[PDB]
Amino acid sequence: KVFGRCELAAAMKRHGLDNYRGYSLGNWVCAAKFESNFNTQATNRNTDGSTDYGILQINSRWWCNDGRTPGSRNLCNIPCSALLSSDITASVNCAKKIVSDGNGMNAWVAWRNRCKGTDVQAWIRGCRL
Numbered sequence: 046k047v048f049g050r051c052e053l054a055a056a057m058k059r060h061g062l063d064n065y066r067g068y069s070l071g072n073w074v075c076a077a078k079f080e081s082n083f084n085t086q087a088t089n090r091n092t093d094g095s096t097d098y099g100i101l102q103i104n105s106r107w108w109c110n111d112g113r114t115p116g117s118r119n120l121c122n123i124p125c126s127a128l129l130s131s132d133i134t135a136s137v138n139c140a141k142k143i144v145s146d147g148n149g150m151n152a153w154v155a156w157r158n159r160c161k162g163t164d165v166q167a168w169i170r171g172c173r174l
């Protein structure tokens with residue numbers, strides 16, 4: 046599914062991401078925009094053989110099992126395919142663990158390069174929560 050911007054903000058807000066670990070809702074919308082273009086079905090293969098999955102491009106090296114990433118961990122304890130559902134609950138729950146691990150949202154390369162230090166509040170303006 047391809048989310049609308051406000052639609053996604055509302056879904057993220059319901060799942061407790063607004064100000065989760067100090068990151069306002071605009072940060073998460075911005076990250077999803079540039080990681081996946083708001084597409085829950087997005088996949089991208091990394092050079093090391095791992096693959097990124099879903100709306101926040103969560104990586105099979107550490108976070109999910111795709112059965113084809115030798116020597117990897119499954120820290121969110123889920124198959125990587127569950128991160129491709131139109132229900133975003135699994136992505137959000139895994140993202141909360143990732144963002145708590147010490148590096149905050151710097152784990153998402155697009156966020157660090159394209160959202161960090163910008164007016165992220167712009168991403169939720171005009172939205173009905």
Ligand SMILES: [Cl-]
Binds near residue numbers: 048051052
């Ligand atoms: Cl929308």
Ligand SMILES: [Cl-]
Binds near residue numbers: 107109117118
């Ligand atoms: Cl894995």
Ligand code: NA
Binds near residue numbers: 067150
């Ligand atoms: Na932080």
